[PDB]
Structure formats: C-alpha cells, structure tokens
Amino acid sequence: TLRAAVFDLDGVLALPAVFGVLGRTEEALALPRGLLNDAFQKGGPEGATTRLMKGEITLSQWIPLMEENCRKCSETAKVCLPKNFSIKEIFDKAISARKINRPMLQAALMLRKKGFTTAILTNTWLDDRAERDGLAQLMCELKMHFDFLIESCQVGMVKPEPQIYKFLLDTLKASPSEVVFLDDIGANLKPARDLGMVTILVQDTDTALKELEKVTGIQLLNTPAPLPTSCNPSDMSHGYVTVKPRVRLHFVELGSGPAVCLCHGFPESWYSWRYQIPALAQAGYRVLAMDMKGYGESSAPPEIEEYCMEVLCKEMVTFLDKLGLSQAVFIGHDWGGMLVWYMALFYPERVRAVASLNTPFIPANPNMSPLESIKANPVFDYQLYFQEPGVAEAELEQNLSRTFKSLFRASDESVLSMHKVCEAGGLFVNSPEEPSLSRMVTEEEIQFYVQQFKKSGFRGPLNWYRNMERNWKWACKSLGRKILIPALMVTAEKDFVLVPQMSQHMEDWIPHLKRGHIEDCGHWTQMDKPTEVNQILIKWLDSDAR
Amino acid sequence: TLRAAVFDLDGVLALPAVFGVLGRTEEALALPRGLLNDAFQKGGPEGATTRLMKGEITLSQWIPLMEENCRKCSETAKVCLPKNFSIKEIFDKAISARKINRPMLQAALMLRKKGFTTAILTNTWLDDRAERDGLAQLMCELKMHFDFLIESCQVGMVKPEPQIYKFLLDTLKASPSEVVFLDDIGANLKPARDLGMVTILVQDTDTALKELEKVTGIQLLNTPAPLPTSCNPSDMSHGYVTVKPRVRLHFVELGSGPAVCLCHGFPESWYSWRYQIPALAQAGYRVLAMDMKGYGESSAPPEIEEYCMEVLCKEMVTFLDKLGLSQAVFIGHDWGGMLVWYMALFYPERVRAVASLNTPFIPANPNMSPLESIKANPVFDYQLYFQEPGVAEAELEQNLSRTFKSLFRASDESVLSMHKVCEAGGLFVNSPEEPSLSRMVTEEEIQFYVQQFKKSGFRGPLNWYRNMERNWKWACKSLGRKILIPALMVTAEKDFVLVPQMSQHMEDWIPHLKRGHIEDCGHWTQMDKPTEVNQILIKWLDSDAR
Numbered sequence A, B: 001t002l003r004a005a006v007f008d009l010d011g012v013l014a015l016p017a018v019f020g021v022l023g024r025t026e027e028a029l030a031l032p033r034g035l036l037n038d039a040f041q042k043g044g045p046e047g048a049t050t051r052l053m054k055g056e057i058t059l060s061q062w063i064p065l066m067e068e069n070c071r072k073c074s075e076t077a078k079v080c081l082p083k084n085f086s087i088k089e090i091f092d093k094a095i096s097a098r099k100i101n102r103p104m105l106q107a108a109l110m111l112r113k114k115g116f117t118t119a120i121l122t123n124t125w126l127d128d129r130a131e132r133d134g135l136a137q138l139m140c141e142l143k144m145h146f147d148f149l150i151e152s153c154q155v156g157m158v159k160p161e162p163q164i165y166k167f168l169l170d171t172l173k174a175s176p177s178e179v180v181f182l183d184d185i186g187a188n189l190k191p192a193r194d195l196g197m198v199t200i201l202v203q204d205t206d207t208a209l210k211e212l213e214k215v216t217g218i219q220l221l222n223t224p225a226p227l228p229t230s231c232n233p234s235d236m237s238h239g240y241v242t243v244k245p246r247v248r249l250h251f252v253e254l255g256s257g258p259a260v261c262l263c264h265g266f267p268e269s270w271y272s273w274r275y276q277i278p279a280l281a282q283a284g285y286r287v288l289a290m291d292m293k294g295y296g297e298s299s300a301p302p303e304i305e306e307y308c309m310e311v312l313c314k315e316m317v318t319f320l321d322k323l324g325l326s327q328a329v330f331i332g333h334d335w336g337g338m339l340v341w342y343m344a345l346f347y348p349e350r351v352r353a354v355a356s357l358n359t360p361f362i363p364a365n366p367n368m369s370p371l372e373s374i375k376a377n378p379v380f381d382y383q384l385y386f387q388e389p390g391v392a393e394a395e396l397e398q399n400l401s402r403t404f405k406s407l408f409r410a411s412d413e414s415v416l417s418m419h420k421v422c423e424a425g426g427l428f429v430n431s432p433e434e435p436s437l438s439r440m441v442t443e444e445e446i447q448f449y450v451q452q453f454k455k456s457g458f459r460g461p462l463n464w465y466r467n468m469e470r471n472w473k474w475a476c477k478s479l480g481r482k483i484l485i486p487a488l489m490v491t492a493e494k495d496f497v498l499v500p501q502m503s504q505h506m507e508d509w510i511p512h513l514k515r516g517h518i519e520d521c522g523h524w525t526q527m528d529k530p531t532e533v534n535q536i537l538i539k540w541l542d543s544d545a546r
C-alpha cells in the first residue's frame, strides 16, 4: 500500500539537530531557558526566520536580524547578553557539528532498493557564509541517495504550511496514504496526518526505524552491512583524450582534490572500480577511472606492440599532459598493477604515489629469458595459452556472458582451474555453458561488461600479454633504480595466481613500502571486498598522498 | 635552409642554471673554488652523475652518492665540510629557483610558428624527491610548446656522447645542417658542430637571440607582445554529462585546483575561452569550459522553456552533482554572465565565487512588464528581432561564415549597427556578403564556430532570448536577497550594447563587489583583450577564490 518514504533532514537524516544547539547554547551561557528559540521564532509566519526558510533572504542577511531578535527577547526577559555573543559563531559551530545519521540513510537506502520513491523534505536556507561548503558537501552526499530533495528555500514554501505537502504529493506522483513521512517536529506531522499520510515522530533513531519497519513490512533495523555505493554508468561524467592520432583513452571522473587514476586489469573495465569511485570522491579525491588501452570506449588498435609496457606508459604520461595534470596517484589491479609500478619506475616525477592490488613488483631477471621465467610456474600456464594470436580471442569472444560469468567468481566458487590450460586446449574445456551467477555480481553488471567487450573484443586486451621480450628488455633498463616514492601493496589472501608470498621481497626494491592484506578475498579484489579495499586506500591516501 | 631549432633546458629555456648554484654555494660557504663541481663530475662517464643522467639511478639515490663525492673531494683538497652541509638542501633550493626564461620560450614559440620543428634536448634526471612536483609543473608548461622533448634519463644517453645527437637528428627527421642547437656548455656544442649543425653558445639571452635571428632570418628580439597560448580543440580532454534524459552538457577540461566553470554567451562556444583555458590551468585552476545548453556538442532541444534561466540553472547544478563538485567558481560573458549572477542568487552554496564579463547584474523591475523594459532602450532592438521563432534562425543560419565574420569584430571594425534591426528587417540588411576578416580571429577559428553551429544552428541559442516573462517572474523571487559571496564585475569600455555605466549601481545589491575594466575592448571580451582578461581573472581568483 505505501509506495513513498519522505525523510526530514534536521533531526532525521542529520544529527545533532540545530535546535539541539540552541538548547545547549542557552544552558552553556546560563540564559533564560528558551530565550534563543524565542529569538529564532520571533514574528511567526512574517518573521526573519520564515523569510529565510522561504528563500526571501540569504543566511548572511538573516544573521544580523536574529541578532536583533536576540537583543529584543533579552530586553523583554530583563537579562543581558554575554560580551562576545555571536550568532554567526553559534550557527557555524552547530552546522559543522551535524553529520549524516548513517542508520537512517541506510534505512532510506533499503526502501529505495525495495522500490519506494524516496525524498528529503526540509526547511533550509540559501547559505552564503564563507563556510557554506561544509553543508553543500553534506547535502551532495545525501541527495544522490534519493529521488527528490525538496528545500523550503528553493520552492518558496515551508513546513508546516499546508501547501508544501501538496507540492510534496504532487512531486511524488502519489496519494497521501501511499506516503510515510518522518520528522522530528510534531507540528510538521500535524498537516501530513490530516491529508492521511502515515507519519513518524522521530525521537531516537531506533524507535523511529521500528515504527518504519512496522509500517512498511521491510526489515530495516539490524540488517546486514550494505555494499558501498556503486556507479550507474549513464550518470557519470565520461571523458575522452586523444593521446596520438589513432588512439583515444576514455575515463569516468568523480570528485575533486588530488587526482587519483585507477587502472583496471584483464579483462576488465573502468567499471571494475564501481565501488571505489564514489567512496574516494567522497573521501576528497578527484577519481579518474580508465578504460585502459584496448578496452571499452578507449581505442583498441590491433598491433601487438601497441601494448608493450613502454608504449602503454608513454601514452598514460601523454594523458596527464593533455589533461594538464603534473601528477596523479596511480592505483592498479592485475595488469594495471604492473603498469603503475612501471609508471613509478619510469616517470616518478608524474606519480604522486603508487598502489597495486594483488600485483607484486618483481624486477626482471636479466639472466633468464622471459618465456623460461613464466614456464617455471604451473599457475601461469594460461599466460602461454594467450600467446598465439587468434586462439584465446576465439574462445573468449565465443560467448561473452559465459566468459565473464566464468571469470568473475569468488575464491570458493571457481569453475575453471588455471591448470594445464594449454594441454586441455582451452580455458573453458571442462566448465559449464551457462554458469551460475557469482554472489559478487548481478546479471545486469555482467551485461555491462558483455556490452563493453562487444565494441572491440579481446585482441587488444590479450595483447597486453604478448610483449614479454620487449617488456623484459625495457624493464632491464630500470634494474639500478629503487622506488622511493610513496607506495602501497595490497595482497589478497585467496588469489591463487597472484599469491601474497609472491610479494615477499618487495621491500628490497621499495624500502618504504606500506602493505595491506585482505583475507578471504579472491582475484577480483575491488568487487570481492569493496568495503575493505576502500578503507585501505582511503587511509593510505590520507596519510601518504595528501 | 634551417628547418629545426633545438634548445637546451638548463641555462637556456630555464634560469638560473643549476651549475649557477654550485658556483655560489662554494662562495657562500667559502669552500675551495670548483670543489662542489669536482664532486658533481667525479668519475666522468662512469661516475654517479652520468648514471643519474642516463636514468640508471633516481635523484634520491644519487644524493647520497654526491655526498660521498663531496667528502672525498674535500679530503683530497684538505678542507672540512660545514656542520649541517646538505646536498638535498642545495639542490632543492637550486631547482625551485630555476624559472622559465620567458624571452627564450617566445623566440622558440615564434620559430615554431614560422614552421620550424622545435625540440628541447636536456641532460636531466628521474626525480623522486618529495618536492618533485615543482619541476614536473615547469616541464609540463615547457613541453606543450615544442615538437619533442628529449631527456637524457628517458633515452639512456647524455650530452656530449655522440649517440644522443644521432638520436636527435633521427627524431627530427632532418640533416645536421638543417639544425640549430643552443646550449650553455661549449662541450655539448662540440659534437653537434662536427656533424655540421649550426650551434650557439648561450651566455646572455639577448646575444644568443641575435645570433639566432642572424642565422634564421626571422625577427625574434624586440618583437611585439605575443597572444596568450590558445587551445587546439582536438588536443583537449572533452567531457559529457547527462543532466536529464534528453540533455547532455559537453565541456573541455584543463588543469587541477579549485573548479572554474566558464560560461560563454550568444552565439558562442567553449572555444570562446580558448585564450583563458591554458592561462587559468597554468595559474593552478581546474578549468571547465562549457558548451552551454543549445550549442556545440551539448544538446539542443527545440522547446523555448528548456532555456528559461531557472531550468538552465537547475541543470548546471545537476552538472555539478553528477561531476561530484560541491562548488565551482562561475565565470560568465554575455548570456553566461546573466547565468552566473542567477547561480549566485539561487544556489550560493554551490558557487565558490562569481564573475561576469560585460554583463551587469540589474535586478528585475516588479512594476514594469519585462517587454516594456527592453523596448525602453534603442540598443536592445535586436533582442525584439529575436522573438518570433524562425525569423532570426533563417537569417543567422543562411550563411555561417558570414554570420560569425559579421559578429566577431572589434569596436572600430563594425559592419552592422544593432540599430532599428526590426524596421530594417534583418541583422545583416546593409552589410556585406563576404566580410573582411577581423584582426581578432583567423579564418580557421571562424571555421571552428561554423562547424559547431552546423550541429544544431540557432534555435537553441536564440531561445535563451525567448523567456523574458518567465525569467522576470522567477527573478522577482530573488528581490529580497543580496549577493554576498565573492564577486567580480569586468566592464568593457567599447561594448556599445552591454555598456559600462549599465553596471553603475551594482554595489547596491552586491556590496563587496570587486571591479575590473578594460579599455579599448569591444563586446567579444575574451578574444579582444585576452591578455588583460587573464590577468584580471587570475589576480581575482588568487585573492578571492583561493
């Protein structure tokens, strides 16, 4: 029956409420109880606060009006304001104090996911204070989670006036009994209740949520931990740079702050970073998530040498020049992990800090032909399968759904061994036609990869594997160098190919290397353990790249 | 006969040279003359400095090797190093000290413009110092001006070895007598001279430039002031955001730092900002140059109300949300100028600072119908011509070259009066078929605009003019507000439509308004006075938006 959920901001999605501070400030300052609130509310519908909340005046204009309401209110109660009394100060402090109430956001989140139309409905102001950015951030983070955000000052109406509710109903395209509205102020519920909306007076969050679970029949409270926010491809800023005339790189770009350039592996996409992109933007970074040369909307020239590490590197440098970035943080996984290490070795001036997931940095052996090196470990056999142009393309292109549904699996869900893949004559030989969906991915997400790989298929991607001689010879030029820029390695416990012990000696060549480790995590690190990954990167970014 | 010019970096494109600092440091510290340089050069082709310059080792690795060469050199001369002696310190200071030698860059610039292949050829290092960003910036600014940049450490060879010169000749695709090479070190010229290259030992810049003018037959020295750097469309990072399902905004993006969003006017393009984009990036800003709704690669829906100021505003807010920017500096010209004022009025939380070129902020008159208001000033007559859908489109679309070649003119170059354009029945009625090229623009630049406007033509653009009722009613909601965020107005002396006196009262509504004025500047401010514009914006950004 209920189809919409509407959340107040102050005192509901955001705590502590700012009436909260007015209560305390009076006590702190030992003023007559409620005096500050009488000021705030002076003149009712025609007073300074209502005009603010309607958007007739800005917050900087109302401040000295409240001041006056604070002089008048105290004259009338026969008490003197403190020397140094500051309305700007109290409110600045109150506003920066408020944070997102996480459990209310997650309860709203879940209701959206179960198909409700959600909205925020708030009395707020046109904020022009020097420090306005704090709240703009907070509102930005909140709104991307809701169908609508209605602001008293934007629409020229306020709670409790009965016209905002009509506007609300009208915006939701729904009738007053399909709607639940939670608000911390009894008076705001009053009129919603009249048109016959379910309401919830919000005191403590848990009780509110109990009422809300009880009224919607959906489990909200004590629910398992939700995934981090993901990215919907078509709501992203997409970017394009020509790095040389036949070749353009595509990327998705979110946030502001130091540039963070994410380099996916084989056979993946910018989308492989879908759970990190909002997290890092939100952490204060400018995220640039590549389609690496050969993939998605980047170009995919056919020639093998277009993908040697040297050329891939030069072209990433070109990508910075053309974007006007002197440096970026380089974060890579799998093949992108190899790429960022070599960026650190060959262009340290352009790398603010380097990090790799799963992919260790192991210096080339100048006295062992590079093919011999690979052949010396059974687990890399699929690499030799990749050599002969045509063969792996044919198999991997033959059924795209199957391909990704076969590859993108957690550590206990495997359906192919990376084992004797040459001898068996295929990567899919004893594995199913229609695999079951890994718990890591929805059908839709696989379809995204499927649709990307239909632009160029696997020639480009596989070519990354087809330059061992060339890459070996190039890498040998760096054998005297060490990596002395900031640097993080993150090992994944149950990656059975890029195993953690492989990384054991990295300190020899990167003496200040910082480490992270993720347990119970397979090869597809970003999507397998998105929560742990974000937390490790955000902590290392704030301390080492900031 | 000469076809290529090659410039050393240290001591040629960049001053003071760092051997410069080694000389001084010894004197400062009263060390045996040349001792520091004997350290630096210890071991000749097999010493620590050569391995650095070949890229065998990084700069952080060489530092403590130089230290040792500084101990050994002093033992042998029988003197003690100062307590606190610091190689890192000396070099940090030396490196941050070096700047681009402007007159050498401009002489290289001009030679490129006269069709020479240019390059930089430098002994330099893989820099991994904490402070490496300083020099990465400097190199970035330099390289975008040259066909090639050859670095000893990137190519594994050094000046004076004769193999780098072969590589040089080979990279330039030219023979040793088609090449001039300027370098501050006699020894580096030695081998270039042998293969028969013209060379120039570079002591003071002016003499060097005299030699270079004398050898190329091109005026380099005392030449008039060059325009600021422009943007070549196809070397730009191009970005795309869907702000609602039928509608995407396109922009060009350069630099890093606080976001600066440039809003062009009618009937223009992101390209109208071509001279500001590199300047502001270079000044430490993240420039986002829009195609405004209706133009270039942004979408151009046909309906008139898609272009009222309210909707244009909401959609720019949406553009920030989707890019993950809580704020941006909004800079506008003409119609974009009107837009940024209203952004400041309606979304101050999202505007870091606001600036307008030519376009004043004049509050709506609530007691005068908006059509009457326009009709009350002869100079705005072309605005009424724009009203009736179809008419202006027909004329403006009829010959695109003519249209822009007619509009884009300086103040003394006019070929149409904005005068009685309704009565005369066209904006072009008594003006030429093939106008002469304004001094402000090259044929190619006009062709760019021509090619952009062929995607949608003028319906979208003209619609910006077709919402006066609607925009008037919307604007009246803001009559109580003031603009109290940071704010700059820049008036153009000889803009005869958006005249400077029009801006006279703006202080009434924007009490902290900062001003700039440009003399001898017509309506197309950015391209008319690109040097003065950049300087006014960069100075206001650094003090007010930083």
Ligand SMILES: O=C(Nc1ccccc1N1CCOCC1)c1ccsc1
Pocket (backbone or CB within 6 Å): A309, A338, A342, A362, A363, A364, A365, A370, A373, A374, A383, A464, A465, A466, A467, A468, A469, A471, A472, A475
């Ligand atoms: O191109 C490959 N690896 C690589 C990539 C980039 C730089 C160096 C290397 N290595 C360094 C160690 O020596 C071999 C080349 C490769 C690995 C498996 S299939 C092809």
Ligand SMILES: O=C(Nc1ccccc1N1CCOCC1)c1ccsc1
Pocket (backbone or CB within 6 Å): B309, B338, B342, B362, B363, B364, B365, B370, B373, B374, B383, B464, B465, B466, B467, B468, B469, B471, B472, B475
């Ligand atoms: O839409 C126009 N102007 C405008 C634009 C945006 C906001 C307010 C306004 N004004 C405010 C002053 O009153 C009239 C509307 C316009 C001007 C010449 S042709 C159409």
Ligand SMILES: [Mg+2]
Pocket (backbone or CB within 6 Å): A008, A009, A010, A011, A012, A017, A183, A184, A185
């Ligand atoms: Mg509340």
Ligand SMILES: [Mg+2]
Pocket (backbone or CB within 6 Å): B008, B009, B010, B011, B012, B017, B183, B184, B185
């Ligand atoms: Mg030199």
